[PDB]
Amino acid sequence: ASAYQRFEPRAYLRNNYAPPRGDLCNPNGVGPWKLRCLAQTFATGEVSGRTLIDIGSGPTVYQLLSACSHFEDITMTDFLEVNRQELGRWLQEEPGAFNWSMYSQHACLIEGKGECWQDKERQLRARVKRVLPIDVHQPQPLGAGSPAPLPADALVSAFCLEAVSPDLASFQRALDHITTLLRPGGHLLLIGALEESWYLAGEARLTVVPVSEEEVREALVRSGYKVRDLRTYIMPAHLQTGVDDVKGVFFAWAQKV
Numbered sequence: 001a002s003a004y005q006r007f008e009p010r011a012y013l014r015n016n017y018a019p020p021r022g023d024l025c026n027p028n029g030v031g032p033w034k035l036r037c038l039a040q041t042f043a044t045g046e047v048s049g050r051t052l053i054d055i056g057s058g059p060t061v062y063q064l065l066s067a068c069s070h071f072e073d074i075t076m077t078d079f080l081e082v083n084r085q086e087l088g089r090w091l092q093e094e095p096g097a098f099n100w101s102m103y104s105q106h107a108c109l110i111e112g113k114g115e116c117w118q119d120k121e122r123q124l125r126a127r128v129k130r131v132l133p134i135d136v137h138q139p140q141p142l143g144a145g146s147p148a149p150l151p152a153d154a155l156v157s158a159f160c161l162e163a164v165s166p167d168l169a170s171f172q173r174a175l176d177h178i179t180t181l182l183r184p185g186g187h188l189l190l191i192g193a194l195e196e197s198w199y200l201a202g203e204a205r206l207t208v209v210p211v212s213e214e215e216v217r218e219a220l221v222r223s224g225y226k227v228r229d230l231r232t233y234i235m236p237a238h239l240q241t242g243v244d245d246v247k248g249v250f251f252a253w254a255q256k257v
């Protein structure tokens, strides 16, 4: 809750998106695995529409790289002001912006359409119309008169819910709250930590509800999704860096019935 007030965006980026976890060179790493699930899913051509919302974007954009070419209106969100400010720095190509080029490249590599990474980042920056505050704990997570087109044709959320939820029940409700933002028939792409109880982000020490793959699936069904795809990545020893206690990472593709 109020722990997210000490959350340092740079430290978080450093902990999860710089080497070793941010080394995209080894295909056996989490970075490549994540981009692969994303890329492969959109490549099916079944996740399509005009609008899309990213839930709890944090200070990261990799989660929209393969997505941006399928939706012309993209909304990014986060609870923290600092995180929206960081997102802004990368969108406006301002100074100090985080460098996502390695990920843009690997997305281009993986997608295999011969695209250059500059055209990818350009497309993303173009299709992201707005960066809105959000709280998944509210029944109306974006608010009343949100500038965001609703309902969205699709949703993306990586490492948010389990990391803002004290327990399974909160998690399930938060899932419910965001699910209302999704048009029926829509698609949800959910990535998150498995069996993780805490992670660091500078002076901030966050509490996490350790969830399992079955608990994630059950939660998706209960929230009213058909689970099209749900995969697990087991965190290798050398990627256990002492910035957290994550055991694995899950990826879910779910369709709203």
Ligand SMILES: Nc1ncnc2c1ncn2[C@@H]1O[C@H](CSCC[C@H](N)C(=O)O)[C@@H](O)[C@H]1O
Residues within 6 Å of the ligand: 004, 007, 016, 055, 056, 057, 058, 059, 060, 063, 078, 079, 080, 083, 134, 135, 136, 137, 157, 158, 159, 160, 163, 164
């Ligand atoms: N109550 C809340 N509602 C929505 N998001 C919240 C939230 N409380 C914290 N968050 C955000 O949840 C994010 C989790 S970190 C995830 C960052 C990014 N999605 C990734 O893929 O790395 C944090 O940025 C945090 O600010």
Ligand SMILES: O=C1C=C2NC[C@@H](O)C2=CC1=O
Residues within 6 Å of the ligand: 016, 021, 030, 159, 163, 193, 196, 199, 244, 246, 249
């Ligand atoms: O909070 C987390 C954020 C992550 N993103 C990459 C993935 O390695 C990861 C694990 C986490 O525990």
